[PDB]
């Protein structure tokens, strides 16, 4: 009679690369890199984004007349902004510390708009001013959240006002300065020429005078407005004073949530779907440690790597009764990885060592978890904006991100290749060790046939075979061997 020791083989075409060899077909493998996304912009954590459409952040907060639908925005999960928006500053100008403000908004999910300086308080100034540049349906206008203060009759009294932040939380206040294209314009609008705008809080102290000069026309106007902003802390008072050229805020914005968010650049719109990880190309529903969808994501996402595949072998080299492991792999043993195949007078059979397979199995599942559970995820907005005078900082930020990406891509690929090699050698050692376990138990009561099979020198029925396949056997007799 005889028993042989063997490895399961299969009908798998799954291939895994290792350090020493490539295209190793294996019986089982796990792909740990996520390559699929929905193609849709979803509600992160079930809360929809702020959809600015063609509005820029400055347009939104200043009240560009074309952003009238953004005048009572509810809580957002992330901000969705188009690149190169149109509804920015309707009146040409610039916004100071703009990138820094956009950064601030990565921590804001909702604002409460508060009327800090009602436009009808300015009883000594004209507050009905506007221009064709901000016109609505041909009707000249101005930013919705601000008051352009000009002369009343022929006078421009010093304009004063203040606000003491009793709103319950730190507030964002935006105001600006008008810089005329001429002196005649300065006199027509403000009467006074040697003007200034003065603003301060317990921490801010600024005074600015307008620059009157000829400039190229933008949106039909030669003049420009500059906007500045500050956060007024709780219980602090902001004081405004002006002799001309002041664009006063009417509203401030109380920061109501202060949670973690971010600004995503995309040309799409919100779809009716949900996600825990949103990329600009669409949401990602996954459990894997790595993805290769897009470098910038908002949410708690798998790590991004520059690779096509990360596949861990979990199974045996797939190499397709009589012959044992040395020749190849039994298609028949589908009840485990390692096992016995045997024959006697009672029956041909096939079997799996359950002890060996279970230990090997747990080794492999621990291996996979040791790789995938070591990745540390977190919420990250992954993105910053820089001005055109900050190239040395933008490039520094880029280098940092590219540097870490190369490190992690490299580590992911080398760990996978090194582990796949060990996995396949692990399985090869386990079948060889099984052969020796049995060989030692059988000693001289069998003949080794040289192909992973032991021929018996005595009759060995199913009871005799079962015990061998379990670690029990002793026959110091029947020396047919002579």
């Amino acid at each position, epitope marked *: 009679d005889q028993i042989c020791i063997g490895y399961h083989a299969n009908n798998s075409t799954e291939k895994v690369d290792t350090i020493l060899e490539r295209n190793v077909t294996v019986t089982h493998a796990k792909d740990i890199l996520e390559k699929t996304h929905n193609g849709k912009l979803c509600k992160l954590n079930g809360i929809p984004p702020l959809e600015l459409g063609d509005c820029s952040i400055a347009g939104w907060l200043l009240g560009n007349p074309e952003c009238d639908r953004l005048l009572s925005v509810p809580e957002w999960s992330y901000i969705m902004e188009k690149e190169n928006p149109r509804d920015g500053l309707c009146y040409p100008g610039s916004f100071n510390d703009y990138e820094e403000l956009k950064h601030l908004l990565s921590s804001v999910k909702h604002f409460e708009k508060v009327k800090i300086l009602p436009k*009808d308080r300015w009883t000594q100034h*004209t*507050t*009905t*001013g*506007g*221009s*064709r*540049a901000c016109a609505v*349906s*041909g*009707n*000249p206008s101005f930013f919705r959240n601000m008051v352009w203060l*000009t002369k*009343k*009759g022929s006078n421009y009294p010093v304009a004063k006002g203040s606000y003491n932040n009793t709103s319950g939380e730190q507030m964002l206040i935006i105001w600006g300065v008008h810089h*005329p*294209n*001429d002196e*005649t*314009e300065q006199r*027509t*609008l403000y009467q006074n020429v040697g003007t200034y705008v003065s603003v301060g809080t317990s921490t801010l102290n600024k005074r600015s005078t307008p620059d009157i000069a000829t400039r190229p*026309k933008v949106n*039909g*106007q*030669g*003049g420009r407005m500059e906007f500045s902003w500050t956060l007024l802390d709780m219980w602090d008072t902001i004081n405004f004073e002006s002799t001309g050229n002041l664009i006063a805020p009417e509203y401030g914005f109380k920061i109501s949530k202060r949670g973690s968010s971010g600004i995503m650049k995309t040309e799409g719109t919100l779809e009716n779907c949900e996600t825990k990880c949103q990329t600009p190309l669409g949401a990602i529903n996954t459990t894997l440690p790595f993805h290769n969808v897009h470098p910038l994501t908002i949410g708690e996402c798998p790590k991004y790597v520059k690779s096509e595949k990360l596949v861990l072998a979990t199974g045996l080299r797939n190499v397709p009764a009589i012959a044992g492991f040395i020749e190849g792999g039994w298609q028949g043993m589908v009840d485990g990885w390692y096992g016995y195949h045997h024959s006697n007078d009672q029956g041909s059979g096939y079997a799996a060592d359950k002890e060996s397979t279970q230990k090997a199995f747990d080794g492999i599942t621990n291996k996979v978890n040791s790789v995938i559970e070591k990745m540390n995820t977190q919420f990250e907005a992954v993105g910053k904006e820089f001005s055109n005078l900050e190239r040395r900082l933008e490039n520094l930020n880029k280098k940092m991100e590219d540097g870490f990406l190369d490190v992690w891509t490299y580590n992911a690929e080398l760990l996978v290749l090194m582990e796949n090699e060990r996995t396949l050698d692990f399985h090869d050692s386990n079948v060889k060790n099984l052969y020796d376990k049995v060989r030692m138990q059988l000693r001289d009561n069998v003949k080794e046939l040289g192909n992973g099979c032991f021929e018996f020198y005595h009759k060995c029925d199913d009871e005799c075979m079962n015990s061998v396949k379990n670690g029990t056997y002793d026959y110091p007799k029947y020396e047919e061997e002579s």
Partner: antibody
Amino acid sequence: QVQLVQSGAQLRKPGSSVTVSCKASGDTFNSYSIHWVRQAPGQGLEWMGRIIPVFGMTHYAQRFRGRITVSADKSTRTAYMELTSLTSADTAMYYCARDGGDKFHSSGHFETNQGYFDHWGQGALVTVSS
Amino acid sequence: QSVLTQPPSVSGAPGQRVTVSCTGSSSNLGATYEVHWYQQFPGTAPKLLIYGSTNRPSGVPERFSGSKSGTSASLTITGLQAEDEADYYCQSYDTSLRGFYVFGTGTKVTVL
């Protein structure tokens, strides 16, 4: 003062049109706008519309949207008003007026719309009848 | 469209104070807009009498003075003279109907 010279009276039939015009003493180059005001006999004043020749901008009273056209040609320094779909009710005198309130500038634009008429034309009577 | 309501007429003897009211609304006398006043003699184009709700053009007598509060306004003529027989009108800018200027109904002033 500022001279604004208005065209004379005209008689028109219902279903036709009316053309009234005023030559301004440089108001089509300087920056004061030109407005049209109507007054039916025995009635008060009605605003009809305006032009700002500096920018080529116009604005009309709601009652005449689609009926009133205002244009100007600064080379002759004249503002024109054209009324269509003329009816028997359009027997009012028409006046031009200079807005001495909102002063405009080139390479910019700004209105407060708190202006007033400092200089008026003479008044062109238009009679509409069969 | 003819929002600024004025009394059909007012009157008084020479030497008396005569006032003309102008009542508007939240869209045009309110909303910070100023009211101008004009003086019109029969057969003649109206002329500016008061502007900015208080100031007078050069050539206008001190006897004419404007006043404004809330959504209401008035013109005061003191020292009424025999020659002050004219229709008076108030004007302001109305923000409704995409914007228009509104003149009032007019007041006739009769000297007794």
